[PDB]
Design a protein around this ligand. Structure first.
Ligand SMILES: [Zn+2]
Ligand SMILES: [Zn+2]
Ligand SMILES: [Zn+2]
Ligand SMILES: [Zn+2]
Lengths: 219, 214
């Protein structure tokens, strides 16, 4: 519906202008209220595009390429949800559900790019390391030091992080020069997905760590 | 019975049953509490009664067999770290945990101060001694992967390892008292790193808990 592109564009704008960063309290009903309706809209859009219109990357028309990011944006929005339930257990437990759902969306997104043979092999190696795609482990994303003496383990982790970081910076700069230069459109859209897939690894790490940390306090 | 025998038993209890199965259990928390109580009473005896470290002005005035007592505050930090409420109410548990972590930090800092008093505190440790849940978790993550910590732990562990072997390796039947003492003091150096570590972990957890309220 309406068009799908305009709808997507409005969603992304709400995200960038009001939901990515806020000056309001994140537990505020004004913030969560807009966040929730945004998500509801994006979920409706996914159904419209993927289910009802039912849309190789050669096969995708230029303006449709944007939509491969719907799960990315669901990832980003969902990780930001918070409950205001008076019940403290319920509100904390809900947070874990949000982080779980955010990560699932993020994984949907990578899996989709992989299905289109678009996935940076750096990102794909990480995606592949999940023994259970639906139960992904922070221990599968990077090598982790065995203990607090494991210098090699820690140096290996730093090596893998630095490689993520450099690659992310590289694609960010390529995306940046493309946006500013704005035939190029198609390249921009593809580069944008590229930057998203790298960003995703950071979000998946942060959410898995954050989830594990907040979970211990409920145990 | 004596101050020194009470200490070895407290430490042995910790190492065997309290350091690492079932932590929410009344049985574990019961044993943790009695051990903390014993250790606080031993603290009163050595620190206040005997005044061991207020009356021996220099580290060399402390006997080798009494160097071990410097770690009292260290073990109190550790024990207190592991205290948990088993109340059905989540908010009570979490607030009770906040309190414990705050009290474990106090002991740990007490331990470093005491090492500082004896001019034994490592210069790096010394300068360490003297935001929502997403940002805290983010910050923790990056701190936890800093190299300096692992490099330093590796070093001290190998120094420790070699000191123990130099102590044991003794076909000549020499007096290895100077080495024994070096071992003990190095072990406190180790503890001091683990303390800075634990203090950060606790402060992070304590800040996370505090967020849940504001
Ligand atoms: Zn440029
Ligand atoms: Zn989770
Ligand atoms: Zn050696
Ligand atoms: Zn605190």
């Amino acid at each position: 519906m309406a068009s799908v592109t305009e709808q997507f564009n409005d969603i992304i704008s709400l995200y960038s202008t009001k939901l990515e960063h806020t000056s309001l309290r994140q537990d505020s009903p004004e913030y969560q209220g807009l966040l929730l309706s945004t998500i509801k809209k994006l979920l409706n859009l996914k159904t419209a595009i993927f289910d009802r219109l039912a849309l190789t990357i050669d096969d995708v028309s230029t303006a449709s390429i944007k939509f491969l990011a719907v799960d990315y944006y669901l990832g980003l929005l969902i990780s930001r949800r918070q409950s205001n339930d008076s019940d403290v257990a319920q509100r904390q437990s809900m947070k874990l559900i949000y982080l779980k759902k955010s990560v699932e969306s993020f994984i949907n997104f990578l899996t989709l790019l992989q299905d289109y043979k678009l996935l940076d092999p750096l990102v794909g190696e990480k995606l592949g390391n999940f023994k259970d795609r639906y139960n992904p482990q922070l221990s599968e994303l990077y090598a982790q030091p065995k203990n607090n003496k494991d210098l090699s383990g820690a140096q290996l982790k730093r090596k893998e992080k630095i490689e993520l970081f450099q690659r992310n910076k590289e694609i960010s700069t390529k995306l940046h020069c493309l946006e500013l230069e704005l035939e190029l459109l198609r390249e921009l859209y593809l580069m944008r997905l590229h930057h998203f897939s790298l960003d995703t690894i950071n979000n998946i790490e942060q959410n898995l760590f954050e989830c594990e940390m907040l979970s211990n306090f409920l145990k």
